[PDB]
Design a protein around this ligand. Sequence first.
Ligand SMILES: Nc1nc2c(ncn2[C@@H]2O[C@H](CO)[C@@H](O)[C@H]2O)c(=O)[nH]1
Ligand SMILES: [K+]
Ligand SMILES: [K+]
Length: 897
Amino acid sequence: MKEFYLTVEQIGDSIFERYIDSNGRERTREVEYKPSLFAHCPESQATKYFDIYGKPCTRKLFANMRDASQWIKRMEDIGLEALGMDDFKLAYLSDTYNYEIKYDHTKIRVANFDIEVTSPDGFPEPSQAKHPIDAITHYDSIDDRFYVFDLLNSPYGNVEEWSIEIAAKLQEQGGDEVPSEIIDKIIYMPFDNEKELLMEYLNFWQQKTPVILTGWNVESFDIPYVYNRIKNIFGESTAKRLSPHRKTRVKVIENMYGSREIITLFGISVLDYIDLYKKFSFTNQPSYSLDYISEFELNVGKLKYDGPISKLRESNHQRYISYNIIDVYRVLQIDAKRQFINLSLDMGYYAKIQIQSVFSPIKTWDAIIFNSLKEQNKVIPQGRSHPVQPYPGAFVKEPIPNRYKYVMSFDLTSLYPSIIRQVNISPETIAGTFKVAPLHDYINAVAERPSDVYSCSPNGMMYYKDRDGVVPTEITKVFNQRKEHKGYMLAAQRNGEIIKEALHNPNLSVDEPLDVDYRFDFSDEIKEKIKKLSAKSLNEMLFRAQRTEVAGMTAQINRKLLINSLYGALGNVWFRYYDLRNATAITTFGQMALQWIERKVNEYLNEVCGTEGEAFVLYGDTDSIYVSADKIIDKVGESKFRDTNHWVDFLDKFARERMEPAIDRGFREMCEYMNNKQHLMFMDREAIAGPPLGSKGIGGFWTGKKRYALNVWDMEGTRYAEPKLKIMGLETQKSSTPKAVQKALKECIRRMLQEGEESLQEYFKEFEKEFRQLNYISIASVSSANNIAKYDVGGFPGPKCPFHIRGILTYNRAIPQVVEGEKVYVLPLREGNPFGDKCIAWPSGTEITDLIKDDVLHWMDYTVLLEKTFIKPLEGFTSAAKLDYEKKASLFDMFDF
Ligand SMILES: Nc1nc2c(ncn2[C@@H]2O[C@H](CO)[C@@H](O)[C@H]2O)c(=O)[nH]1
Ligand SMILES: [K+]
Ligand SMILES: [K+]
């Protein structure tokens, strides 16, 4: 079989590679790679190698990688360009795997692990590793087993062994409810001292060395801590055994507050799952803790345990070990439905890069373009340094703060990559420049046509229309590949149905599943044989068809991500193909496109509605516009509609049959104005929002850029039974917003948009009345404790001290401990309180210690709390929407109705 690599590393003059050989067995080899680079040569020198500009090149084959590195330096000193792939790992992978890689993930050892550490304060510093590791949960994908290393004796407490029988029992039976499916997959190993624990873990590691090392927050805590702990206890040499090549690299990261440590283990690809999640998930959750993402993805309640998390081992060691196991399973569950690990492998093998490079758009695209050009004997340009110069970003319209009853949004398809293809922007397609007028002149089409022969962008750049272009050609390839895999996905879908229709009274005769390609529709002859297969064979065929569907899904999602990350690479000064002029040409064209279409839509709606100078477009952000449909609805007459679904259908039709054609018309004109290579500005209806028919709801409101709320009924063709609240930038989900207030503010917004001012006013009165009976933890706000010592002057706040830091200081005077950088709950205190200040703070996720809890709660300033956390932000919403959360005085007040 075709072999595939696992990991690759460069150590001196050799490439250390772990891979799956022809016999499907994992192996390691050291290769004295002889790299090739290129230098320009005279036309006289005949060759097949040319750079992207068409200039001839000659190949230089080196004896070793060190010589190639020196040569580059020598060329640079002189001033000559040194072309070719300077990252020898990519060159090696490109030469060694000169074919489309077909990998088998079941042979790739993926470890998902977790390291637990008890400490008096509860947030031990990884770079120090001053405390013992008292629990290690290591799930191995090949063995499909959870290895649990449990420390029984510790200076922080001696405990008894974990009970695998108690773990399964339900909550009421005093159990932990460890899923029945994984109970038999647990290998529990108790230890009396940390040294034996760690040494056995280290041996275990040498036998089942991870290829892919993952888990939640593994890069910032687990890895650094175990590496440093082993280093402190057994010495650096022992710690280096965590790397199959005994080579390690410790990088220190600087930040506003402190320094972090990141350990690179040669021979291992670390993919912290929290980062993998943040990169591939198409959302932006207000929190990325395992509990939050678990509830969101798996819809399961966060683990429950009384008391602080740093006290869980001492207070309930049984639940401590059971939960560590469950948390790892949780990550595994999240990967089961999101498939991010596999997505990483798919993307990695596609680009032919180290798997961990998926976190780097420039690295990924560099390899893709490199391998693609190599097939045409084209040589890549040497990377050149560029200063970080800020250039125009996306266009975001300043909205008029107000309520907007009916809104309809439209958006462009893959904007930036489409612009690249439309204008044909690439380093080698630059054809010149033209005298540029102000941007508003192109938007209004008052400026003279830039060029009659070249494709233009509003920033003053011109490109050839006749030439393909490396960047645009590569985008197109990926786009065509996405459709191809989409086709396989659908084919494996129709084939799956043919197999299911057969599972209805299948023949009993014994047979085997057919050897067919599920990516293509079944031929006639295949469908006839399928009519005679037994259930056993059909079920096996269904399993394979689905396996094919998923692979198709992963492949097309991979391509989508590649396309969406390209612009980021092109705007990165470290990208080989970066060009400030091209980055600017893309963004300014984007800005022109949105404002040009905003003018077109306004002109069209004023005409159609017989109005004048009316502003229909109320907001726009990057690739979408929001249109007020109030006038459109009035034109028809609201009493003319039967129900909500009626006006929604009307706007859907109006958008599709009227506005869209006008928009397409507007964009084709812009394309001719800029004389672009091809029209790709495709904008169509996205959402339709408004209040339910016959209600007094306001539908939606904007407070400013990126701050608004909409009551959505339809999203690109899919009609919702229950409207969905689209809320953005109103901080109703922000971690600093108290729990009860997050729910209250949302309810306030739902009522405003769906029921009206009156309903809002009754809920406001209701929440305010109930506020003082809610649990104190649910109404406290949350802040991060940064720079505590800075304002710590003899125990009291120095000048310019933050409100929450002041709280932390009064807490310290009063007395869990507050750890630098960590989060804390904050509560204001009434004047005359015994704590000596206007507020107090304590560790988040915990109750206030008993010695002061009741005093604190008795001095809590509920009024100030309510005003600051609830009323202030609500007032922001209502002022923008022109409403009162409190009924204004009326002449009818003095009456008793
Ligand atoms: N065509 C091409 N080959 C390259 C480049 N950089 C390195 N090579 C090497 O050229 C050789 C094969 O044609 C291999 O050893 C490649 O790794 C580049 O930009 N283009
Ligand atoms: K964790
Ligand atoms: K836990």
